[PDB]
């Protein structure tokens, strides 16, 4: 937070919501422009190439207000004391759930023991809902997925869902917003799969600021974002994103617990 031409000037950053920084900034700059306008501030906006990159940018002091992912926030909080102000709503909900999905014909009476030795497909390690959360779940009950299952990492959620539906793999990670989107789009037949495990609620994101960011501004940013009507918030953001709720660190407990058990919060 600095002064330029006699005015507050803010550095904003948006996670990679869309396949390119250009497309992300096109669709999400409006909520940031709105925020800066409501403060009478000028601004800069960047969109790093990865969810990890925006966490690093915030940690390394390059960002006044960041749209971080939940794990990016928790890590940045641990490393630099980054504070969360709010969480974005998608179709009115500020949270999602990580899933493990299975072929509909899998005989699973006891989870996960009945699935021992089956194929499991998790995502690339940088994906919170596809890897961090389910891997932390297995570790939390004494399971090493690489030894317990016929295990693969690196699949996309679309690969997992299509391969499950076609009977080629057994279990795969997904997240509920994504699975629903694929059903709505007619891209998968949900009768051929079932949810065998769901996480607790995970916050969609974290609107974040540095440690010791001016308390007056924190409050004002929170008020400006949480005051938005569904229609006004949606007019300023990509499809589905339609409000903000006030947030606090404890909302991220499931995320923090997962990073904790995988040794990702050790100094």
Author numbering: 2 to 268
Sentences from the paper on this structure:
P. stutzeri WM88 has PtxABC, HtxBCDE and PhnCDE ABC-transporters for the acquisition of phosphite, hypophosphite and organophosphonates, respectively. These transport systems rely on a high-affinity periplasmic binding protein (PBP) to impart ligand specificity. A comparison of the HtxB and PtxB structures showed that sequence differences within the binding pocket essentially eliminate an oxygen binding site in HtxB, providing specificity for a ligand with two oxygen atoms (hypophosphite), over one with three (phosphite).
This change in mainchain conformation results in a 180° flip in the N205 carbonyl, requiring N205 to adopt a different rotamer in the D206N structure and leading to a new hydrogen bond formed with R178. It seems likely that this rearrangement of the mainchain very close to the hinge region, together with the concomitant change in the hydrogen bond network across the domain interface might result in the D206N HtxB mutant being unable to form a closed conformation in complex with phosphorus ligands, explaining why no ligand binding could be detected for this mutant in our solution studies. Comparisons of the D206N structure, which crystallised in a partially open conformation, with open and closed complexes from closely related proteins suggests that D206 and R178 are positioned on flexible regions of the protein that are brought into close proximity during domain closure.
